[PDB]
Every structure is written in C-alpha cells, then in structure tokens.
C-alpha cells in the first residue's frame, strides 16, 4: 500500500491505475504537543525529596530543576530509550492529587500499536486512559485501570482477554496493572494487538479478516482513529488503602516513556505526510482535498465522496475523484 | 576544595552529584567535607581498595544502578561516619564478606534486584549497628544458611520479598525485629511452627506469596503484632478465632482473594463490623458462591451452633495411668478450649506440658495426680455460637 499512481498500458491508450495508499506506521510521539493541569505539577521549584519503590526509609534522592542532572522534565516522557519525568508529592493532603496529561495532535491519526506507559515509581491505584476525534473539544474513555473496580469506579473487573470479536469497542476496567510484585511491575499497557487479534489472528497473518471489517463498519474504523489522548491521573501508588500522613514524600507519579505508535488518516488517499508549521498533515493525492482527504477537489464532482478500501489485497481500490460533468 | 570535571559539584563540597554521567572508574577528586556521594546509572564494575579512605564524614554513599560485580576488601576503608550504603541494581553474584567490615555508623543498607546466588554463614555480623536491611528482588538466589542473619540484634527492619523462597528463613538472632516484608515470593502455606522468636515484630507483609491456606495457631507467636498484610494471596477461609491472641492487632489486609462466604466467615464479617472503624484496611470480596461474589464483607443466611461428635464420659483410673477425655467436633474449623475445676482455661495453642489439648480435642494426660481430681468442662466455639459438655473425673 505504498504506491499511489503506476503507470499503467492499455489497449486503447496509455494512462495511471489507482491504488489504495498508506503511509509509514512510525513513533508518533516525535509529533505531539503535551499539555499538563495544574501547572506547576512538576516538581523543581521549590526542591523536594522523594522515596523509591524498593524501600519506604530509601529517601535520599532529590528533584531540582535548576541542575540539569537533577531536572525532570515532561520532555523526557518522550525521550528516545532510562530518563523520566516527575511530579510533586502530595504535601496538600487530604486533597487528592489529579494529573491529566493531555497528548494534543490536532490531526486524526490512526493506531497501528498497543499504547504502552513505562512508569518509573509505582502504578497508579485509580487511572483513566482517555481519547477524543472532535480535537479536545469532548473526551471518551478508552480503558479504566484501578486496584478495586466496584469501589473505585463501580465497574466489574474484566480484561481484554477476556473480551470477544463481537465486543471489541467495549470499555473495560482492569485490575492487571495494579499490584506491584509482578514482572512489568511498572508497565501499563492498552491492548491493541490484542484487540486486532480478534479479526486477524493470534499471529496476525490473516490481515484479510480484519481488513475486510475495516472497510464495512465504520465504528470500528473510529475506535482506534484519535485526534488527542489523556492520561487522568486520580490517585497515586499507595498499595494499601491506609495512607501514611508524617511522610507524604513516598507517593507521586513518574512517567519513564510513552509509547504511541500508529499511522495519520488519509482515508485511504495519502502516502506522504508532511509536518508543516508545527502541524502534521497529508499530501492529498486521487484527486483529494482537506487536512484527512475527506474533501473531492472541485471540478472533480462526479461521483461523491467514497474512501478507499484494502480489498483486493495487494491493489486494494482506491475510489478517487472522478470529473464534474459538464 | 577539588573538584572532579565529570561530576556536579555544590557549593562548600557536602553533596558531590555523579548521575547520568558514563564512568567506567571511581572518580578521583572527590572533597573530605563531602557527606554524600550520588554515583546513580553508571558503568562501574570493581570499587578498588581505599577508594574512600580521605572521607570520613561521608554519610549516605549512593552505587545504586551500576554494573558493580565485584567489591575489594578495603574498599569501604576509611568510612566511619558511614550510616547509609546504597547498593541496588547491580551485577554482584555473592555478598562481599571483607568489605562490610569496620563500619560503626552504619544503619542503612539496600542490596535488591542483584544476581546474588548464595547468602553465607556469618553474613553481616561485622556489621552489627545495622537496623534496616534490605536483601530483596534476588531472582538467582539458590541458597540460605542458617546463621545468615547472626549478629544483627539491632535490625528492626528486613526485605526478603521477591526472593522466591518456599520457607520462612531462620530470623531468629533479629530479636529488635519490628518490621518483616516476605511479599511476591512461593511460600505454600503457613505452619504453625513458622515465625517463632520474633516477639517484639509488630508489620508483616505476606502480599501475593502464593499461600492457599493457614493452619491454626499459625500467627500465635507473633504477640506484639500490630498489622498483617495477606493481599493477592489463594485464601479461601480462616480458622475461628486466629487474632485473638493477637491482643495489640488493629489493621488486617485480606483483599484480592477467593473468599468462600458461609456461616464460617461471621466472625472476620464482625471484627470489620467492631473492631474495625470508621477507616477499614482492606476491601475483600468474595468469589463463592456465584449469587454472592464481589461483595463486600458484612448474618441474614441459615446458621448453625457447633455439634460434638463424642462427649467426655465419666471414667474411673487410678495415679500413674495415661488418661484422656474425648471431645471430638464435627468441623476442623471450630476452636476447643478446656476448663479445670481449678479454674484456669486451656487452649490447643499452649504448649504440651503434661497436661495438654491435641487437634482432635481430646485432653490427654501423661501422669494422674491428686489435685487434678474434679469436675471438667469443655467449650466448643464456632462464628456463630459457643456450646458445652460436662464430665467427672475419678482419681484412685
Ligand atoms: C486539576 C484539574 O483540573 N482536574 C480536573 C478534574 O477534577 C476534572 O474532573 C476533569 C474533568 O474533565 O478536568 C480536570
Ligand atoms: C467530568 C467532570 O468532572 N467535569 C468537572 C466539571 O463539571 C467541573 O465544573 C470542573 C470544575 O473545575 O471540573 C471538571
Ligand atoms: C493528484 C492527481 O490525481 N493528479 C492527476 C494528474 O496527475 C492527472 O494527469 C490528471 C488527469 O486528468 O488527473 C489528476
Ligand atoms: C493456583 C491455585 O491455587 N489453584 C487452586 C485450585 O487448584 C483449587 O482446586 C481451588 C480450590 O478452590 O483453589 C485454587
Ligand atoms: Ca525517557
């Protein structure tokens, strides 16, 4: 799905055949825009002393903003990998200590892959994993992660395995990534994979079956298309439901990395996306027009507005702009 | 005054900062007023001999996140101010017996996520000013001697979790013990025998180690005990009155386990009703039976009092004779306790001193004296009500 236009031969004359197009699925991370509320969340000013995940009395490292060795940044979130981002620890108590990390784009993009967050101290006991389509204007919910289900969110704990083909846009709430004595003790992931494995295959060579439902239900299309991302962060890493008060220094929230892959909407027109002016955006092609190729180009009005489709598979059909009538 | 170009230094020289940076050596330069040392995500392999010998008012040594596999013996020479030694995340395969040695300031040492293979006889004795020590994530670890934790009478805190270990460990010589973390490791289930000596231990964590279940008078030893953590575990049930010789007990943590709620699960539902307050440590919720799963804890269901199977019949004996009083109940669960005509009630739990109370209930006697003449009782307790059987002993 690389090509666009071919030059093509045939019995009366010599012109181009079109073909379904798609571009490079790369680390999408390299292009957003983060957003932090409250602002002042990011601990630095002035200093403070935190407590590692090992041990509750290992308080000995400290946050400075000023020394560039003891900074932490939210550009370390996205950092090529380990360097990790930091926020203050709740010395307002009982106030309880939100985080919202907004990913802007301002551009529909596509995820090819599972949205991984390497945290470096703890996972939190009470966490929304969010999206929007209309450009931060509303937000919808894409999974719920909390330590008790019924009680933090009134929600039964299920799981993505446990989900089926017919229940993929399904909303569910975890409890996976809540106890902290596991291997990936630190990683929390959104299973997309897993929930592309449903169609495909566990192996994921079957690409037909998947592609095939693509193309016909269009809520399934917009299930993994995402303008902007949230993290909603409600309470931190405490393990226990009683909170220590004297030393409020042990709870906070550290990011390692983000890891948001997938490819921007073209609604099968585009190959090559251009960041112009801090913006991604695609280099419409068939005879296409817009920032997602959702347009015809006027003169091109023949037949109406029609995305393309991966079926047949290699040369899926392209369904471009064919001119006005006259 | 000196001042290393690799490393960060702060004003006066107290606080000397070496992270992120790559260094394959221990830098040299390093000030005597330095009273923290911070060698955080390096390439360090061996910490040669008097490598700190100048500093001795250095306090906190940070060589956490290093390739660090091999340590000298005169290594920590000259630190006697010494208090916190940071060692996690790193390539050590045994614990370094001539290094840990002429330490008196030292209270603090982390040794996790190392590849050590076999803690030794004598472990840590050099250093006996120790009160926390932190030994955990070893996930090539294959041994444990016996005198591993010898000479440490003044450790209050200890981190044994993730080590995957079956058996609790000989934690006798830690008699100053508060604090016992054996969280995330394959312990299959808790005896009675386990635990002993560790009087003065008031926190135990016993989160997701595996356990499917524990056998009464298992926490009986554990009389100072103020707080129990038995999160992610594979409990189903608990034997009838397990905290009651825990007297100082306030906070136990029972959740993310498959609680089979029946009539033998009133007396946990009633200590979350009383003894525990307003603010409640766990959020347990049952599994079984399907119509009842994922509430929470807390008598509306049929219940029944305890039944005896046996009563204690009247028997005639003469001195010297073994004697026994059968008193055999319809569930293991139930807890049988005795009372003598002098008074004085006698559990399972107490120790087998000539006059004593075995699983089944029966109260065996090894030698027949004078005194022990008169009218005997015994109390049959369950979770929903108590029950008693009168018996007469004749002494000849
Ligand atoms: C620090 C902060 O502003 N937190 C708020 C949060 O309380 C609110 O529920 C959410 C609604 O979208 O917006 C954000
Ligand atoms: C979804 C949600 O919680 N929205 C709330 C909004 O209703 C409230 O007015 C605002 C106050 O800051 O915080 C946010
Ligand atoms: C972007 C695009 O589709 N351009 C094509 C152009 O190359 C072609 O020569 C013309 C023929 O009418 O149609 C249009
Ligand atoms: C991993 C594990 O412990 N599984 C056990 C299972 O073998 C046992 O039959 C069941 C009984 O309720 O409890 C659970
Ligand atoms: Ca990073």
Known sequence: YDLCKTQIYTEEGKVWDYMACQPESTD???????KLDPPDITCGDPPETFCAMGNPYMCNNECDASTPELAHPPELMFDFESTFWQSATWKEYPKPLQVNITLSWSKTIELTDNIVITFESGRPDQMILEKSLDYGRTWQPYQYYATDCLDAFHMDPKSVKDLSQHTVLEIICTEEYSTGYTTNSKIIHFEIKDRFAFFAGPRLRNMASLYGQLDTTKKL???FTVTDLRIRLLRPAVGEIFVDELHLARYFYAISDIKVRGRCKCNLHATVCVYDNSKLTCECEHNTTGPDCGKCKKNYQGRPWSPGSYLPIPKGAANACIPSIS | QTCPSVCSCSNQFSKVICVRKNLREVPDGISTNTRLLNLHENQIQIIKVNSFKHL???????????????????????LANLNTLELFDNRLTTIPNGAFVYLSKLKELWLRNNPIESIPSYAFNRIPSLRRLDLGELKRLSYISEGAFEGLSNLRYLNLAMCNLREIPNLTPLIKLDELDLSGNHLSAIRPGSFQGLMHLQKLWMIQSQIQVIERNAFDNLQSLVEINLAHNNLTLLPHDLFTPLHHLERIHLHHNPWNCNCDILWLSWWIKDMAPSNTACCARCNTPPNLKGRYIGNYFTCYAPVIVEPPADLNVTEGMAAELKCRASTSLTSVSWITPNGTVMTH??????????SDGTLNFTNVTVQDTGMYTCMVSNSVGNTTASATLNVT
Request: glycine share 6%; hydrophobic share 45%; net charge positive.
């Open chain 1, 28 to 34: 999408m991370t390299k292009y957003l825009k983060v």
């Open chain 1, 221 to 223: 299309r917009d299930f």
């Open chain 2, 56 to 78: 001795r008012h250095l306090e906190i040594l940070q060589l956490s996140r290093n390739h660090i596999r091999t340590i000298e013996i005169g290594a920590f020479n000259g």
């Open chain 2, 349 to 358: 739990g107490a120790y087998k001193v000539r006059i004593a109370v075995l």
